Ligand binder design. Structure first.
Ligand SMILES: Nc1ncnc2c1ncn2[C@@H]1O[C@H](COP(=O)(O)OP(=O)(O)OP(=O)(O)O)[C@@H](O)[C@H]1O
Ligand SMILES: Nc1ncnc2c1ncn2[C@@H]1O[C@H](COP(=O)(O)OP(=O)(O)O)[C@@H](O)[C@H]1O
Lengths: 82, 712
């Protein structure tokens, strides 16, 4: 019941989902404006993205209302890099 | 009466002690001189005295910092002496503490040099901690070194050095170098024996010269693993205050040949140089094991070198050697002869009081929850040595962390202190940790104390009186036996139906004379016979001798009736000296297969028949079982006793257990569908309907016939 409490990870709003990117951008990632509003994210301020087993990168954040909240724009190149 | 009472002080000054003029009058002290205050564990300080008539005579005023440095609490008694050799300091070196300078950077040594030592002439001593205010912080520094020795006073011309790096604070605490008598519990007897055997040679060597004797040197303390031997040795060494030097068996044995002998010689020579000194060894069995199994040359040369060094020790020298080993017989026998390790001590598993004290000692820093019942834990936990208790506390804390982790997120590198404030260990955590424990000492024959009185024994009054006359008198009235010349018998053998109250009788006997009970079941003897078991019967009897007085118990002695074990037992028992207070109690349900040799005079010659309990005995036994279980009001056990003719104690206990189980099941069903937390008549009715007898009538007739045959 609780003995496996450590294994389960707490949920938080900052974590997001992975989906294929319509555009071919590599260093630029687009998210819905509402997601930025929840985290109060603005334009022109670079984002540190952390993936799995410490993999990290820096991307450029863009406004994309079309996309589901918590859904990201990252192609096979960025997916392999992370 | 020069000792003075330690009192809390409102003032925070670190170099002022205020006392009444009558305090000086007691020691005839003169104003304007510092005084030396010495507490415990070789802790001392020098303080500038001031006159404060407000303080009542015998009352002092020392800040909390000085008491903490001295390792003393409020209300303690500290010895106060004058300072005839007051001296100033010429060169003092002191470094800061990094954790104390957090939040403010820069060099505050220059800031503190002038304001704090402006002709103050504050007396200083090695290792002192002094706090000075800098900016918005109060930083404490330590006295690394002072010259000239030994303590001196901080004169203005004194040159102050600060070239070095800060040193942690808790590092000194965890060094283990500071542990007194307070850090041990449940070993009062062994601790007292070690103190008597160590302090006297060192503290007062003149006694032995006055009485004309060479003081003993070889002390060998052995006990189950993780029993605190090393901790006790360290505590006694620190309390003595003499020079210390430790040798580890694994460490010495891990280096190639030659180097081991060089290290041993260097250790012995250095210890001799700085007498008084104490030399301690660990796992001495590893370096000097039983020669019968290790035929390697390296161990032979190591043990020979150790023997030569021990023999060559000069006649008059304040050095005491202490060794530790789990198996008393494992070490090479050559070490046990006179002029070598002879003062043998055995450390047994702590009893309830010992467990309570150990738990209190360990549970002194954890965030204990409001509801804790350490007494219940002490009562429940049996067979746990100190190490297992520490592990239990650690596991309970771990379970508490498991419960509290859900609030926090482990991914982040920081945890909010608000959560930390909420950490606490509740009773359920201890219960779970105990459920997930693993004691190991009880799996081997180990001496433990028992506290069973004649009340627990349900009847057999005549046997009680016979046993008293047999055992108690020689234990408490040996003068009468010496005067009459009759030697005390030791060999007693109980025989009768199983489950008739034999082990409890043995425990009661061991309790009456205040002796260390030792248990050895028949399967242990069988394992020893087949060689799988580690300890041998010789080890059992050696431990019994070292722990005298003792009561050894031999259950199912007919299970080995094999002949080698019987021969060894006969040899060891006959070799035992009757004058020694050692007793052997054998039990067997079949007193016919026992070899005749065992029944010879000077051996297990006393035969005692154990009959089945009587109606009064059955009633008393049932009452004894029903001490914590609530009962239906008006319940009468006389009918049960009358309907249980020919029953045994075990059968009655099982009856009680099944009745309790039925009551518990009924409570479960009622709660699911605790208004009824006790037992009622129907449960006892079912239990008696499910009754039986563990012994057939034919066996009872055989027992009676055998008893009458022995009588005739
Ligand atoms: N009164 C006590 N008796 C036994 N152990 C104690 C006691 N108080 C604390 N302990 C814990 O027991 C351990 C100290 O005993 P230690 O493990 O050194 O014994 P040992 O098995 O005789 O040692 P060695 O490694 O020298 O053979 C430490 O964990 C200490 O915290
Ligand atoms: N006088 C007595 N006679 C028999 N059994 C007793 C007596 N007093 C207590 N008992 C109970 O007998 C039970 C069996 O004890 P135990 O030592 O296992 O017996 P045995 O040594 O005969 O196997 C215990 O639960 C104990 O409380």
């Amino acid at each position: 019941k609780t003995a496996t409490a450590i294994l389960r990870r707490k949920k938080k709003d900052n974590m997001l989902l992975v989906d294929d990117a319509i555009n071919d951008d590599n260093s630029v990632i687009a998210i819905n404006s509402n997601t930025m509003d929840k985290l109060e994210l603005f334009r022109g301020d670079t984002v540190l993205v952390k993936g799995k087993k410490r993999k990290d990168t820096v991307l450029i954040v863009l406004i994309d209302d079309e996309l589901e909240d918590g859904a990201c724009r990252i192609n096979r190149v960025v997916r392999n890099n992370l | 009466d020069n000792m003075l009472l330690v009192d809390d002080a409102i003032n925070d000054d670190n170099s002022v002690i205020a006392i009444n003029s009558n305090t000086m009058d007691k020691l005839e002290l003169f104003r304007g001189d510092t005084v030396l205050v010495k507490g415990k564990k070789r802790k001392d300080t020098v303080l500038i005295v001031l006159i404060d008539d407000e303080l009542e005579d015998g009352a002092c005023r020392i800040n909390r910092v000085v008491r903490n440095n001295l390792r003393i609490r409020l209300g303690d008694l500290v010895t106060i002496h004058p300072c005839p050799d007051i001296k100033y300091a010429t060169r003092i070196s002191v470094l800061p503490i990094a954790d104390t300078i957090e939040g403010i950077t820069g060099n505050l040594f220059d800031v503190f040099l002038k304001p704090y030592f402006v002709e103050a002439y504050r007396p200083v001593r090695k290792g002192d901690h002094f706090v000075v205010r800098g900016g918005m912080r109060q930083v404490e520094f330590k006295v690394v070194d002072v010259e000239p020795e030994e303590y001196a006073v901080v004169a203005q011309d004194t040159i102050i050095h600060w070239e070095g790096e800060p040193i942690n604070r808790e590092d000194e605490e965890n060094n283990m170098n500071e542990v007194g008598y307070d850090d041990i519990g449940g070993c009062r007897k062994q601790m007292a024996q070690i103190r008597e055997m160590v302090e006297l040679p060192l503290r007062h060597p003149q006694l032995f010269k006055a009485i004309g004797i060479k003081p003993p040197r070889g002390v060998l303390m052995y006990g189950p693993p993780g029993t605190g031997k090393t901790l006790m040795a360290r505590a006694v060494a620190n309390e003595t205050g003499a020079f210390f030097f430790l040798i580890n068996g694994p460490e010495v044995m891990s280096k190639m040949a030659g180097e081991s002998e060089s290290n041993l010689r260097k250790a012995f020579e250095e210890a001799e140089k700085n007498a008084p000194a104490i030399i301690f060894i660990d796992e001495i069995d590893s370096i000097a094991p039983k020669r019968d199994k290790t035929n390697g040359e390296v161990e032979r040369r190591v043990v020979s070198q150790l023997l030569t060094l021990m023999d060559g020790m000069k006649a008059r020298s304040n050095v005491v050697v202490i060794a530790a080993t789990n198996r008393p017989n494992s070490i090479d026998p050559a070490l046990r002869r006179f002029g070598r390790f002879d003062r043998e001590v055995d450390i047994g598993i702590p009893d309830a009081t010992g467990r309570l004290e150990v738990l209190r000692i360990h549970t002194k820093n954890m965030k204990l929850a409001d509801d804790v019942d350490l007494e219940a834990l002490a009562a429940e936990t049996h067979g746990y040595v100190g190490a297992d208790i520490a592990s239990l506390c650690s596991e309970a804390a771990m379970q508490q962390i498991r419960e509290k982790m859900d609030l926090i997120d482990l991914d982040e590198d920081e945890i909010d202190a608000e959560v930390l404030d909420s950490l606490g260990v509740t009773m359920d955590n201890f219960r779970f940790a105990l459920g997930n424990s693993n004691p190991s000492a009880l799996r081997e024959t180990v001496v433990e104390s028992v506290n069973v009185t004649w009340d627990d024994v349900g009847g057999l009054d005549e046997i009680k009186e016979e046993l008293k006359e047999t055992v108690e008198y020689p234990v408490l009235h040996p003068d009468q036996y010496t005067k009459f010349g009759l030697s005390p018998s030791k060999g007693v053998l109980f025989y009768g139906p199983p489950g008739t109250g034999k082990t409890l009788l043995a425990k009661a006997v061991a309790t009456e004379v205040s002796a260390n009970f030792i248990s050895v079941k028949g399967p242990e003897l069988l394992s020893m016979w087949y060689g799988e078991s580690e300890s041998n019967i010789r080890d059992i009897f050696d431990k019994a001798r070292a722990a005298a007085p003792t009561v050894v118990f031999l259950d199912e002695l007919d299970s080995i009736a094999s002949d080698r074990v019987v021969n060894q037992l006969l040899t060891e028992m006959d070799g035992m000296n009757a004058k020694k207070n050692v007793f052997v109690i054998g039990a067997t349900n079949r007193p016919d297969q026992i070899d005749p040799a065992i029944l010879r005079p000077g051996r297990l010659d006393q035969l005692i028949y154990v009959p089945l309990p009587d109606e009064n005995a059955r009633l008393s036994i049932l009452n004894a079982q029903l001490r914590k279980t609530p009962l239906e009001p008006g319940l009468e056990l006389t009918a049960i006793a009358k309907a249980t003719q020919g029953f045994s104690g075990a059968d009655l206990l099982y009856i009680v257990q099944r009745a309790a189980k039925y009551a518990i099941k009924d409570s479960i069903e009622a709660h699911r569908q605790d208004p009824v937390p006790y037992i009622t008549k129907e449960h006892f009715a079912e239990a008696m309907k499910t009754a039986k007898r563990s012994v057939s009538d034919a066996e009872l007739r055989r027992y009676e016939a055998y008893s009458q045959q022995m009588k005739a």
